[PDB]
């Protein structure tokens, strides 16, 4: 039976999907947090230094405020996703 | 660099830019490498430690 377990583990990696899915979900979580920086969120440009280099403060405040609002809301979304997945992994740790 | 402002470490890179390519872009829509506007040379932008 030990030899059969070794043979199965050497043959297929699909058994470890219960860890692969968690690792992958963390991967798309950080990838989402990365790619949400590229969004304008109603601003004229998504690059903060580009906004700073173009505009005077009386409109730069509004444009940067829009960018901050979009980025923070996307981050809060990531925070709640991480918290609920932490609750899942907590229950999993309790069971283990 | 041609109006593109930022803070980082300018190092010599080994990236193979095509002759019509003037800068490189990372995944997060941030500048990764640039071509010098005065010298036909390739430099990578690494953020400071």
């Amino acid at each position: 039976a030990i030899g059969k377990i070794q043979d199965s583990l050497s043959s297929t990696a699909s058994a470890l999907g219960k860890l692969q899915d968690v690792v992958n979900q963390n991967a798309q979580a950080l990838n989402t947090l990365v790619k949400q920086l590229s969004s304008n969120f109603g601003a004229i440009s998504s690059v903060l230094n580009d906004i700073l280099s173009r505009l005077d403060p009386p409109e730069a405040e509004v444009q940067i405020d829009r960018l901050i609002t979009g980025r923070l809301q996307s981050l809060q979304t990531y925070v709640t996703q991480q918290l609920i997945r932490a609750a899942e992994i907590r229950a999993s740790a309790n069971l283990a | 660099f041609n109006g593109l402002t930022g803070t980082g470490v300018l190092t010599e890179s080994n990236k193979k830019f095509l002759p019509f390519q003037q800068f490189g872009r990372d995944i997060a829509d941030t500048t990764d490498a640039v071509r010098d506007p005065q010298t036909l040379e390739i430099l990578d932008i690494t953020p400071c430690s």
Binding site: L33, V34 | A28, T46
Partner: peptide
């Protein structure tokens, strides 16, 4: 990567995890 996101290392790495499992198996 360079956008302020970091990965903190775990307190117990793989070596002491393996030592804990070895102690449990031996016991």
């Amino acid at each position: 990567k360079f956008n302020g996101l970091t990965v903190l290392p775990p307190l117990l790495t793989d070596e002491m995890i393996a030592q804990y499992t070895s102690a449990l198996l031996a016991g």
